Structures are given as structure tokens and as C-alpha cells.
């Protein structure tokens, strides 16, 4: 219902290493009155899945309860059911895929009984996007309009398709559940067609759990791993993707990775860049890097130092009636400066531009 007067730009980070993987993450509240995003990041899983990893972003709505419960418990609902455990030995593709389906459906109903028993007041819901990573497979998991992508061989190899109510099959389901899609929203309100929680949207008599107005059913894709070609995976809520496309963000992260191996920092830059491109939502990014992720380049670091220094001289020159930061950014944009980070553009350089402005106009 409301925005803050000024954005909360404080970063919450995590990082880790194991099973040949490196990860960083960054979350920021931004312009929104609340922080309703959640996440999971775990390298090495219980019960003989030490060599497996799991990462996920949760974009909560109408509260954070559903998202928070998911970020702590979705993983064991997924792995601790009979479908995931099916066959005697290691789980098959089908096992893993049905395991995730069941995990999603069972946690949703689990939360529903919990809320029904304790007379819960919140009507919250949550998207989930994530990857379950085995020695030989990346399993992409999507439920809602959060998004994940795989960069392989300097390119977008795969990305998750957002569940929007106006998508043909989502629309079909919603209409069979006796609702409608008005513009982009389920009955004029909800901007997602798939999510955990939203129990008010799951009350149609004579319709299965996956045939309600809002569905908890996940979409899973098996991608065979490529030791040689797999570079990195990005997972993020719509707050990021609203203001950057797949190619852009993929290129941007690449440009950043060529400057630092610090992944929390790369994730920070994504979130800030997105804030400065005009995103007014909560923002959460997870970055998972494979052994052949882009490496720090001596030249790229130098190019960045030269750009940084150049940007600082430009700021000094511009302040000669003493223009404000907004007007300095305007001038710099109209200068069509070359060699700005791909995807990030000027926005990705605002922290550098602003630090300078503050050194020269600290009042
Ligand atoms: Mn949200
Ligand atoms: Mn959001």
C-alpha cells in the first residue's frame, strides 16, 4: 500500500564454496515499506546427498510468512518424500522431477492445515525459483514470476518461463476454476498464476490442487551438466528482471566477474544497478559459479580503473551554479560515454559517480 520516503539500500549477503561450486547472494529492501523476499543456499544436502546443492529465491506477497517458511523447509519436503526416494539406489530424473512436484504440493497443504489449525491471519503467498544441482544435472525449478537462467559458453543456455495469468494455459485453468484474467491479474488482483500460499485463491469445489485459480505446481527442467561449458546460474525475483533482460544481465554479470571473484560484490552491483535503472521493488539475487565461470582479467580491471577515473574527472568538470546529482547524471548520459558495462549502462556506475559528487559537494 505504501513506498518508503527513501530506499533502504542495506545489503544482506551470503557466500560459500563446495562441490566445485562458488556462490554469492545479495538482498535489499529498496523502496518498499517491507522486505518480503526470502532465499535458500546450501552446498551439501542431508541423507547421502552431500554432493548435491540447492539454491532458491522466494518473492513473497501480502506478507513474508509463506516465503520464510519455504526458505527453511521446501528442500526437505522435496527430498523427504517417497517420489524423490522411489527406486532403491540414487534417484532417477523422473524421481527428482516428481519428488519436487510432490514437495511443492505437500508443503502447500502442510502450510494450509497449519494456518487452519492456528487460525492464521495472514493471507500471504510466495513464488519460488531455484536449482537443485547433482553431480551430473542442474534441475531448474520454477513456480511464479521469479526467474532463473543458466549461462553456458558466454550465452543464455536456458531460462525459466514466468507463470503469468495471461499465459494461454494459465488463463485456461483460471477460467475453468470460475475466475477471469483482467489485463494481467487473476480476478483483477493477483499478478501471478502460480505460487505457494494464497489459500483464498485455492477454494474451488470439484477442482484438484493443481486446477485452482493459483497453482502450487512447479515446472522442472533437467539440464545435463557440462564441466567444460557451464559458467554460471542467476536466480532473482521480478524486482531484478522487471528492469533487466536475460541477455543484458547475463552480459553484465560477465563484465563484473572479469573484475572480481567476490560474488557478494557482484550480486550487490546487480541489485544497485537495478535500483538505479528504476526498480522500486524488493530485490534478491543468487549467483552460482561453475569452475569455468569467467576469470578476473588484468586488462578488464585496468579498463574499469580508467573508466572510474574518467567518470570522476567528468563530474568535477560538470560542477563548473552547482547542479544536483540528478542533473549531473543527465549531462553524463547525454555525453554517450563509451565502454560502459554491458547491460548495466550508466546506472551500474552511479555508485562511482555519486561517491565523486559527494567528495566535491558534501553539503
Ligand atoms: Mn514481494
Ligand atoms: Mn517482487
Parse the chain into domains and list their residue ranges.
Answer: 1-294, 295-363
Query: % helix / strand / coil in the chain, to the nearest 5?
Result: 35, 30, 35
Cβ contacts of 214 within 8 Å, gap of 6 or more: 125, 186, 190, 192, 193, 194, 195, 198, 201, 202
For cell 567444460, the residue is 228
Ligand nearest to the CA of 37: 1
The reported resolution of this PDB entry, expressed in Å, is 2.5
251 is in an annotated binding site: no
Experimental method: X-ray
Max CA separation in the chain (angstroms): 76
60 is in an annotated binding site: yes
Phi and psi of 325, rounded to 5°?
A: -50, -40
Quick one: 207 exposed, middle or buried, by C-beta within 10 A (0-12, 13-18, 19+)? middle
242 is in an annotated binding site: no
Q: Identify the CATH homologous superfamily for domain 1-294.
A: PPM-type phosphatase domain (3.60.40.10)
**Ion ligand 1 residue ranges (Cβ < 5 Å):** 36, 59, 61
Cβ contacts of 92 within 8 Å, gap of 6 or more: 86
Q: Residue 58 in contact with residue 146, Cβ under 8 Å?
A: yes
Q: After which residues is the chain broken (C to N over 2.5 A)?
A: 320
CATH 1.10.10.430 is held by the domain 295-363: yes
- Here the cell at position 124 is 500471504
Q: Angle at the Cα of 324 (from 321 to 330), degrees rounded to 5? A: 105
**Which bin fits 30, alpha (ψ -120 to 50), beta or left (φ > 0)?**
left
CA distances from 295 to 60, 73, 75, 122, 298 (A): 34, 34, 31, 46, 10
- Going from the Cα of 36 to the center of ligand 2, the distance in angstroms, rounded, reads 8
Nearest to 200 by CA among 112, 102, 114, 127: 112
Q: Residue 230 in contact with residue 20, Cβ under 8 Å?
A: no
Q: Residue 101 in contact with residue 158, Cβ under 8 Å?
A: no
198 is in an annotated binding site: no
Cβ contacts of 19 within 8 Å, gap of 6 or more: 43, 44, 51, 52, 53, 133, 135
The number of C-alpha atoms within 13 Å of 74 and in the hemisphere containing its C-beta is 35
Q: Angle at the Cα of 28 (from 23 to 34), degrees rounded to 5? A: 135
Cβ contacts of 275 within 8 Å, gap of 6 or more: 7, 9, 28, 30, 283
Cβ contacts of 115 within 8 Å, gap of 6 or more: 122, 199
Phi and psi of 24, rounded to 5°?
A: -130, 155
Q: Given CA atoms 173, 176, 177, 182 in this order, what sign does their dihedral have?
A: positive
- Alpha carbon 106 to chain centroid, angstroms: 23
Cα Rg of the chain, angstroms: 22
b/e burial code for range 134-162 (CB count within 10 A of at least 16 → b): beebbbbbbbbbbbbbbbbeeebbebbeb
- Going from the Cα of 28 to the center of ligand 1, the distance in angstroms, rounded, reads 12
What gap in Å lies between CA 219 and CA 142, rounded to an integer?
5
What gap in Å lies between CA 204 and CA 15, rounded to an integer?
43
Q: Given CA atoms 231, 146, 71, 249 in this order, what sign does their dihedral have?
A: positive
Cβ contacts of 320 within 8 Å, gap of 6 or more: none
Beta bridge partners of 53: 43, 133
- Here the cell at position 195 is 505460487
What gap in Å lies between CA 44 and CA 287, rounded to an integer?
17
Q: Residue 336 in contact with residue 297, Cβ under 8 Å?
A: no
Q: Given CA atoms 104, 107, 111, 112 in this order, what sign does their dihedral have?
A: positive
103 three-class SS:
helix
User: Quick count: other Cβ atoms within 10 Å of Cβ 274?
Assistant: 27
Q: How many residues does the chain have?
A: 363
What gap in Å lies between CA 148 and CA 129, rounded to an integer?
7
The alpha carbon torsion through 135, 138, 144, 149 (nearest 10 deg) reads 130
- Going from the Cα of 321 to the center of ligand 2, the distance in angstroms, rounded, reads 40
What gap in Å lies between CA 342 and CA 256, rounded to an integer?
10
Amino acid at each position: 500500500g505504501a513506498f518508503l520516503d527513501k530506499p533502504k539500500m542495506e545489503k544482506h549477503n551470503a557466500q560459500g564454496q563446495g562441490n566445485g561450486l562458488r556462490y554469492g547472494l545479495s538482498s535489499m529492501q529498496g523502496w518498499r515499506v517491507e522486505m518480503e523476499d526470502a532465499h535458500t543456499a546450501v552446498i551439501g544436502l542431508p541423507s547421502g546427498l552431500e554432493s548435491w546443492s540447492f539454491f532458491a529465491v522466494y518473492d513473497g506477497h501480502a506478507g513474508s510468512q509463506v516465503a520464510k517458511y519455504c526458505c527453511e523447509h521446501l528442500l526437505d519436503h522435496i527430498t523427504n518424500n517417497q517420489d524423490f526416494k522411489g527406486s532403491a539406489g540414487a534417484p532417477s530424473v523422473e524421481n527428482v522431477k516428481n519428488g519436487i512436484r510432490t514437495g511443492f504440493l505437500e508443503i502447500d497443504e502442510h502450510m494450509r492445515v497449519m494456518s487452519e489449525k492456528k487460525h492464521g491471519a495472514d493471507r500471504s503467498g510466495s513464488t519460488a525459483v531455484g536449482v537443485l544441482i547433482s553431480p551430473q544435472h542442474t534441475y531448474f525449478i520454477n513456480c511464479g514470476d521469479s526467474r532463473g537462467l543458466l549461462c553456458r559458453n558466454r550465452k543464455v543456455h536456458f531460462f525459466t518461463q514466468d507463470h503469468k495469468p495471461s499465459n494461454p494455459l494459465e488463463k485456461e485453468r483460471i477460467q475453468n476454476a470460475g475466475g477471469s484474467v483482467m489485463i494481467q491479474r487473476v480476478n483483477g488482483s493477483l499478478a501471478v498464476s502460480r505460487a505457494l500460499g494464497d489459500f483464498d485463491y485455492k477454494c474451488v469445489h470439484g477442482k484438484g490442487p493443481t486446477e485452482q485459480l493459483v497453482s502450487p505446481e512447479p515446472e522442472v527442467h533437467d539440464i545435463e551438466r557440462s564441466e567444460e561449458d557451464d559458467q554460471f546460474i542467476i536466480l532473482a525475483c521480478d524486482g531484478i528482471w522487471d528492469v533487466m533482460g536475460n541477455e543484458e544481465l547475463c552480459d553484465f554479470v560477465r563484465s563484473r566477474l572479469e573484475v572480481t571473484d567476490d560474488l557478494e560484490k557482484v550480486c550487490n552491483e546487480v541489485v544497485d544497478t537495478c535500483l538505479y535503472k528504476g526498480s522500486r521493488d524488493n530485490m534478491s539475487v543468487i549467483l552460482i559459479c561453475f569452475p569455468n565461470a569467467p576469470k578476473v582479467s588484468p586488462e578488464a580491471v585496468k579498463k574499469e580503473a580508467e573508466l572510474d577515473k574518467y567518470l570522476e574527472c567528468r563530474v568535477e568538470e560538470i560542477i563548473k551554479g552547482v547542479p544536483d546529482l540528478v542533473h549531473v547524471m543527465r549531462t553524463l548520459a547525454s555525453e554517450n560515454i563509451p565502454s560502459l558495462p554491458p547491460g548495466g549502462e550508466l546506472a551500474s556506475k552511479r555508485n562511482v559517480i555519486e561517491a565523486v559528487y559527494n567528495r566535491l559537494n558534501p553539503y
